[PDB]
Amino acid sequence: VGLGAVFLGFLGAAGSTMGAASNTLTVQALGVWGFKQLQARVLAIERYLEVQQLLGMWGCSGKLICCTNVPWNSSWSNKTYNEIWDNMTWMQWDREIGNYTDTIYKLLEVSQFQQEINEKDNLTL
Amino acid sequence: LGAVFLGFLGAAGSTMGAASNTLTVQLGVWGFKQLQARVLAIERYLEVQQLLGMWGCSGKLICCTNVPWNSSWSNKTYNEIWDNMTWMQWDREIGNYTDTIYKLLEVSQFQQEINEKDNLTL
Amino acid sequence: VVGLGAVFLGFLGAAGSTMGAASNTLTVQARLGVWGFKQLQARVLAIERYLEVQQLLGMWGCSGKLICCTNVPWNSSWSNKTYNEIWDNMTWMQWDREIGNYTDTIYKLLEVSQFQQEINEKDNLTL
Amino acid sequence: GLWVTVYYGVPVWREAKTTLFCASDAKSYEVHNVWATHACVPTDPNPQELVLENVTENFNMWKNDMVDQMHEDIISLWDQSLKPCVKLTPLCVTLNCSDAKVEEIKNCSFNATTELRDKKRREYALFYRLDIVPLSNNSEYRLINCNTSVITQICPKVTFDPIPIHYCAPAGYAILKCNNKTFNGTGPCNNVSTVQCTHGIKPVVSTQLLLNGSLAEEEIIIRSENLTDNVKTIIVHLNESVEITCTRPNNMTRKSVRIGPGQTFYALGDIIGDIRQPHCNISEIKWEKTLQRVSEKLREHFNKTIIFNQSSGGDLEITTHSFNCGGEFFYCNTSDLFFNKTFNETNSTITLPCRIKQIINMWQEVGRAMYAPPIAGNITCKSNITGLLLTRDTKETFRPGGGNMRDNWRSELYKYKVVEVKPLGIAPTECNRT
């Protein structure tokens, strides 16, 4: 499987509610055309390096799920855990926080950097 | 990238146990034809680095897993199969079960994540 | 274009500081056709730069995190100076110029050190 | 708690234009076939549909970038095939010409350079009237497009079998197939489903009636950008499609004649038997029943009398049912009993009188034209009429006329949309790393 098993399989959960999306695991049970295909393979690779790069540099590398150490900001939304974690499709959830997706990443980058230097500053000391 | 795989190709003729020692001992036609080759090298490495990521034990030289050894695959225990076989023979034994092994391992990784998530969600 | 090059620019920043200031200073960042084919070579080559620097870490068991502590003796014949005098008196460019001679040997030494560490760990799993 | 967390798997997508690449069913592999040639990514275990349950999604077909890429291909793919072939430039000389009957299938002669650049040698070659043009009336004819374009001839090596072609998206994207059996061209699709590669579309270049197209599911469909607009095009699909066949009884065989050193081109040698005009037969009852059903469907979006009036005319590219067959194109009147009357609310068949054309100007680009060599032996084919390019013009008059041939490709890529998957979900949670 090139990478379609993951980047198409993640639509298998589809617009099912977040509660379902958190535990839906059993569902698995030369020439011109050459140039068009080459541009596809190179572009396909880039779309995979992009997410792994950010997922990699955050300290969340490899691990499928991981928690973080930067607290929530109520400005992002008021509705809380048990209200959003159920009775809402994720794609709908992406609508309201896309207003901060371009900035929330920076908090992960700075928080991760602080975390890893904190390790060296204690182990090397 | 890629060129290091020749080091792994060493000790092909050896016992599976003895393989650990060898690693211890260790534009234009020409332009486009190279680009087609160069992109290929990346793909067959990312299709390798991705499998480990999908299997959770990313990067580490060896992996310990949770799924059991079905006797239908091979009922030779530890003392035999590591004795005098290179992986060429072992590939023939395990060849028919490769794909089911991959997906079986994958779900075993996905299900332990939620188990790890239980402590964070209980 | 941007994703694999944004971090590289940040690394180049504050190069003029010595390593001692450089450690905490890094947090200050926030605290077809000719011109189609040419663009293809740039996009492919950019991956080969990130993939190399990341792939070396896997060989060294230094995956994921920025800094990683390691297990391999310091071949002190490389330099009289140690941490207490090189760390606050020199910059990375100066460090590379006098250390680049040995670099390839350390990678092989660091390669075997990582290998034996994980297999000696396997010797702990197989005890 | 209330700390942010990340998930490296989540269903999310955005509408994104992206390059696509080919996949084919590996129907044979001789590598001179225009479309495939050396061929594209080999096949797949095609059934891959996914439930994608109750995801409310909407999209509009007339803006999708996938159809445009299928006009970046073809026209660029034909150029990749026509470039090595011969130029018919040296053949643009004054033609002495006459008739061949014991229909306008003429017999022409000209100067022509032999193997040497110096000596000349008279050669006779036949031509249909749609190639020659009057000099201003008898004799001294000339090739039509030579006054604006560099005429070139398709090499006999290649063929034009409309082989199925499957469109895949690069890994990391997906195609959201729409399954609602009355999808009215644009709007919500309540039963969307994903698929890695599309259906096997056939590169059939129709211009007034869409041949070999996919059948609509259990209901007649009518699509348009704006049904209330007076000028914009309209596309109709069908269910239980109707038959159409065409044959040329003339048992022709190609002669090869010299044009300078090295270069050669092929033309008609002789008319075996006798000239019988090309025919096309269509079941009269099927067409009447079929168009009658569409009449009700067309009525219920205007609520008035609908009148079929034949095409506008002025040429043969626009006003005729042009289609490819074997490698010798047809341009056909499609009006005798096919239109010109409407409904109030025998087991014979309809006839279409029509003809052949060698030099075809295609894609409506000035400066380029292609010459199709004659195909030996009598030629026959059968196909399904699966769509009409009706154009709207108290009452309402519908004129069968096709706009740009991109309409044909929008007639089968209607149920597809390109999406970019970005599985990097963010959410709050109780935890924090310890």
Place this chain on the structure above:
Amino acid sequence: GLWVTVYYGVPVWREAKTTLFCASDAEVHNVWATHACVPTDPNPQELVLENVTENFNMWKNDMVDQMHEDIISLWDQSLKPCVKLTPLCVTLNCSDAKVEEIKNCSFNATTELRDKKRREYALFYRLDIVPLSNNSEYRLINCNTSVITQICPKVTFDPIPIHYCAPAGYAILKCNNKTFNGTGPCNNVSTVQCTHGIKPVVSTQLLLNGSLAEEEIIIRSENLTDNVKTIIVHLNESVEITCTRPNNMTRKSVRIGPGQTFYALGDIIGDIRQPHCNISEIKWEKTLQRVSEKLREHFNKTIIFNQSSGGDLEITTHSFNCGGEFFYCNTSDLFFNKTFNETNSTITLPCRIKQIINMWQEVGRAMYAPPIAGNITCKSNITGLLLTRDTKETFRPGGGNMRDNWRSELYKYKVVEVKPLGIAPTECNRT
């Protein structure tokens, strides 16, 4: 110490020759690609790179060589679909334009079919048709050399700014020492992802539309003590130049051979008025005065300027491009021809148009530029001189090649690779 540690993200850089790609922002086609490319790449993304030194030179550079082998390909890649204009190369019989620099020729030509030919007449400039030996019979200048290709009538070939941007994983160390001459430690260095933007205008004696100098006249050369290496001067207070072709000319579509035509000059409306280019002499005179002092201190002796004539009219004349039309001016009628001891008006230059050119100093590739209908009034800034070092020192305008134009703009950049791997001892060991 006692233990090495891998430090990812380390600042370390080394020289590297590698490819560069698009940039554009803000129709049919343009010769400089730009019809589809990456957008905008805003400017303020620099890192000032505080107080780290870097020494480099502009002459052993990669960008200029990386570029001159690209522009020469961009034009060559554009002219493939359009007519090779060889069939026009036949015996011309030419009369004078009865409305000496223009001639009105007649020739036979192949019409829309092989054998029927007609007599046609078209206008030409005497600079590029040679008598076939009064004779009074001529041919196109470039027929014994190579084919000549018509510039496609629909495309346009006026300059558009293009930014060079290095691939991800590299950087471009822009030097910011405003008084820098292109060789030495740039004590105020900076790095940029995508360059600021450079204009592709071709010239031979004046750097038109170029980036202006800042608070200095800077003279740059690999060797000021060499009599064949080029001297480049970068100008304080760029002067303004205007060029025009005031003839109200019209174009006629003469048909030759089959297929496509080639556009040619028709009637010279009104009366012949030779083209001219205007300069304010006081501006130019005291602009020359400024450079007269700068290079003096580099030679400690008096200087002179001269004509630079004695060539094939490509390098000796002020050859440049503007408004879809080409120009070749004497540019030393009285322009330089002066030496320095220490009114509102203008000085004017007589100039010549040429219909077909051979650019990039090569042979095997000449092209025909269809005339621009109507009058044009080309106006541009001037920022540099391609002076040549020929008791006292003699100077003469004119470069040695055409890469010198690009070398004037890309001097403040050098492509560099970043190596984010560095080993350093540290006290810890793995837990």
Place this chain on the structure above:
Amino acid sequence: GLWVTVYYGVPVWREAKTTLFCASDAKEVHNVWATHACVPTDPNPQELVLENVTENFNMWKNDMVDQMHEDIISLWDQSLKPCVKLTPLCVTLNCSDAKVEEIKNCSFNATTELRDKKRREYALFYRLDIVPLSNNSEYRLINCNTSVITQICPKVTFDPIPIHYCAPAGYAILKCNNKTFNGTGPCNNVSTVQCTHGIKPVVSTQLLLNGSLAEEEIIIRSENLTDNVKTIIVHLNESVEITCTRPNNMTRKSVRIGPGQTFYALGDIIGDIRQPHCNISEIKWEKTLQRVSEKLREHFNKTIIFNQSSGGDLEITTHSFNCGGEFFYCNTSDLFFNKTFNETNSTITLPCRIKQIINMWQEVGRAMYAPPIAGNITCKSNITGLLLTRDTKETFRPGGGNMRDNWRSELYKYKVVEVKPLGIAPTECNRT
């Protein structure tokens, strides 16, 4: 019992097909093969032992040689297209003879700088290039009626620089070292390398040239020895030297064909013309065919005989090779094989003749004009392999039936394998 473990770096591999790429020592100037493109350096001491692993491969169904011919044929296409085409020269061409039997002082009308004036001209052509149009006064170039013909730019040269193929990073190229290799089947000694250390793209159709001499022992190769259509390949040990030479002093002359287009032709014969010599050390050659025959007897238990080539055209019947900027075509049968043996200082000569117009790859619609090199040219070289076709006794005729078979004499010992270092095995450990 026991649990699954995944071991990275497992040495398992499988057969594959790959788009290989090029590399070379470095050389400047418009060399046709290496160009300014191929990757430099790769000094390769990395011959890994790969101790005693069994492996099998056959050079016949190998899909690396066909990849070598998928390019090179395309490589010249990259270099023919820019250069001047030679169609306008196809004019009624009137020849008498040349003297100051095989060279014509031939005259023709060609257009001058402009397309309105003709200009009488004279240009030499070797007898092969022209064909009599007819007792004979008119001639024309041979390949005019079948194909358009182009002209090689003198700027490029065919001097074969060696080229190294390289597996893309991630594959591996195997190598068999059993010097008595069957030609097919398991090999007891195997090794691996990223890039092979030497191949030469020299074209030959009857005898190999500059090739790697066999590894200390004579070798015989075939798809099927007991067959009469498959080409036998012999690979000599203790190679035998050859030398061909053009002793004339011909001078190049440039003539024009319409505007822009022009080409180079042989102006005048200078000095006494002699037939192009091809000398071979007959003293070595005699027992050289004796030794290969003894090897052939080792497989067929009876005497053998050698005849001339199969005759017919000048593509199957003749030693054809490049001396560099010039094409040779030698009889190489009349005074050279003729016979066999039972069980004096001199060197044998061959009749040979030059051909400007060639039909390389023997396919329709393709041809080229070889620009003559002025003056004398000599090229000493080594013969290392004969190509034999099989016609009480055994008969052979030199001359391979297809030029692709030549490459098998140098790329036999390699097979591309896709190293796929992902393997599965049990273990006692489980994730804890």
Place this chain on the structure above:
Amino acid sequence: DIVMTQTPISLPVSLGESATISCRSSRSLVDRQDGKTYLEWYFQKPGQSPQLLIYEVANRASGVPDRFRGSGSDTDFTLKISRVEADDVAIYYCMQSLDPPHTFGQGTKVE
């Protein structure tokens, strides 16, 4: 060498009438040569030099009218004036131009 016969040697005529002139070849003429019938006609008023009328049997000279037309077989050649007028008075010459030396005929004097 090769001799052309002519008939008529003279022909008086008034305005508006049509006239016909003929000349015959001796040595075959149009002997293949990958060419064509190289026969020509010339006319000359008194005092002025000869000028071209017809070449290649049936092709008129530069800008001359349709007052006349030429025709001929392999060896027989003819010339006809569609409508004579005042300025047509001249001596008409039959000239062959196949092989050197070119040979005229001894005039055709029409009034």
Place this chain on the structure above:
Amino acid sequence: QVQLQESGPGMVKPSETLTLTCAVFGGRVTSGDSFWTWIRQSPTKGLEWLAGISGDADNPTYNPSLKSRLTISKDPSKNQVSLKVTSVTATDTAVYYCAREKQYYFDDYYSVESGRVGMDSWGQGVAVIVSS
């Protein structure tokens, strides 16, 4: 077209050698498309063809009847063609012309047509009389 003019003495003594010249206006003597030739209009025999030369530098050919006594050449330096008559007889008294038999050669890549338009343009004709 080519304007043309004969020049030379009109009074000639018996039995002497006569040289006649013709200067070309608007062209080149040596250009291959032309074939210069000279013709005489005798009173008894009429028109007759003497000689012509052009194209291949040295390419003269004379009428066999008068092959013995003719010579003709040209030079671009003055752009004229001159004819020498050796041992003139009283019968040679006649008007001599210089004429330009026009050839052509057009190469349109595909076909290379070629031919001639006969003797397009003639000179005024120069009268020479053999008397004393």
